Design a protein around this ligand. Structure first.
Ligand code: TWT
Ligand code: RET
Ligand code: BOG
Ligand code: PLM
Ligand code: PLM
Length: 350
């Protein structure tokens, strides 16, 4: 007697009043997310593969990048094909309630994980760039490792709530994927939602700003200091130190872009969410929630691409392993020069 009938999950009444979006929409959605899965898993596999095998990229900090890639790989995997894609092509979620929970639970856990991982990357950047050259700190495997343990502890904490009643993962949009329940306005769900948002999200965002705004408010602190030591009897060997800071600033610059990618990726959705939980639910329509979530899912597939066009060592690696990828973004040795000077160690001060 209806088109949203799911014998496994109880569809919130809100999604039931609307009319079924057109077949083309379902087919496109599936095809769309199915490509997020391919590019997402491919691109992140490529970054994990290269970052773990290439000795040039073998630095403690990079572990965070590995962690971010494993996070996005999984997101793209579980969230694209087959769970959602297949659902779409049938215009129905057919994998049951447990699959739904797992689906939504994985979705949030790694979403939180990627920003909190980016947080750690923002903190690393602050050590080697935000502080002065005199006290610059490089990430140590020990530090890094504990840091990713925080990331995993954390992420799971703010996404597991619904698994235990404190909130709930269920069907949303055109009913072919799952997420957290942002409609149901009771106490339990509202605190979890406020929690997910404030701790899972606003949380690492502060870390991010505090670190970058701290790296900008030290650009000059370093600009002056670079000269003080410059004329401080520092020979041609000064050039070395200079390329290194250029090197790091390049990675620091990268950080912000992948983070920017994230925000611009999740904010839309986050917003439509809160509207439904606090504002005009008549606003939160099929496409009002759907499309902005799609855009949110594809987020886990941009990092690999940002690296492929802005990471020298990594781009070097691709050129040497899957060069057919860097076609439209051809690699050149000159892109690795700054790392040469920075690493080349002057013997006995020459
Ligand atoms: C399940 C059936 C899939 C049919 C796909 C037909 C598509 C042709 C695609 C060729 C795909 C190569 C994908 C692996 C490469 C990962 C791309 C990610 C971009 C990474 C940039 C560093
Ligand atoms: C297909 C999408 C799924 C399974 C999404 C689940 C998402 C969450 C539990 C989202 C949490 C958030 C972030 C990771 C960042 C932005 C803000 C939130 C609170 C919406
Ligand atoms: C894009 C996210 C940036 C991740 C920061 C990785 C930090 C690795 O930065 C690396 O530090 C090494 C010394 O520890 C330097 O020798 C490398 O040139 C530099 O790329
Ligand atoms: C539902 C769980 C999904 C987990 C997906 C795991 C696949 C990620 C690929 C891991 C590559 C790690 C390579 C390390 C190299 C060594 O060996
Ligand atoms: C407007 C969308 C059109 C569809 C084309 C989507 C292209 C995404 C596929 C990624 C291919 C890998 C590109 C890596 C090159 C960089 O560097």
């Amino acid at each position: 007697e209806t088109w949203w009938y799911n014998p496994s999950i109880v569809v919130h009444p809100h999604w039931r009043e609307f009319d079924q979006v057109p077949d083309a929409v379902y087919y496109s959605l599936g095809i769309f997310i199915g490509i997020c899965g391919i590019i997402g898993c491919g691109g992140n596999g490529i970054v994990i593969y290269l970052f773990t095998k290439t000795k040039s990229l073998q630095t403690p900090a990079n572990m965070f990048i590995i962690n971010l890639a494993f996070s996005d790989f999984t997101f793209s995997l579980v969230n694209g094909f087959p769970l959602m894609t297949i659902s779409c092509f049938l215009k129905k979620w057919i994998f049951g309630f447990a699959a739904c929970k797992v689906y939504g639970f994985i979705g949030g856990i790694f979403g939180f994980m990627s920003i909190m991982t980016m947080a750690m990357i923002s903190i690393d950047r602050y050590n080697v760039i935000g502080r002065p050259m005199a006290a610059s700190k490089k990430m140590s495997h020990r530090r890094a490792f504990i840091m990713i343990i925080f990331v995993w502890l954390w992420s799971v904490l703010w996404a597991i709530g619904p698994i235990f009643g404190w909130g709930a993962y269920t069907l949303e949009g055109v009913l072919c994927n799952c997420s957290f329940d942002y409609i149901s306005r009771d106490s339990t769900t509202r605190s979890n939602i406020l929690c997910m948002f404030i701790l899972g999200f606003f949380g690492p965002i502060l870390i991010i700003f505090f670190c970058y705004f701290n790296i900008v408010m030290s650009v000059s602190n370093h600009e002056k200091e670079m000269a003080a030591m410059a004329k401080r009897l520092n020979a041609k060997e000064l050039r070395k130190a200079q390329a290194g800071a250029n090197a790091e600033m390049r990675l620091a610059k990268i950080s912000i872009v992948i983070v920017s990618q994230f925000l611009l990726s999740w904010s839309p959705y986050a917003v439509v969410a809160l509207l439904a939980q606090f504002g005009p639910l008549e606003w939160v329509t099929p496409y009002a929630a759907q499309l902005p979530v799609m855009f949110a899912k594809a987020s886990a597939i941009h990092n690999p691409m940002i690296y492929s066009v802005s990471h020298p060592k990594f781009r070097e690696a691709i050129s040497q392993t899957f060069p057919w990828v860097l076609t439209c973004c051809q690699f050149d040795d000159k892109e690795t020069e700054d790392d040469k000077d920075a690493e080349t160690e002057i013997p006995a001060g020459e």
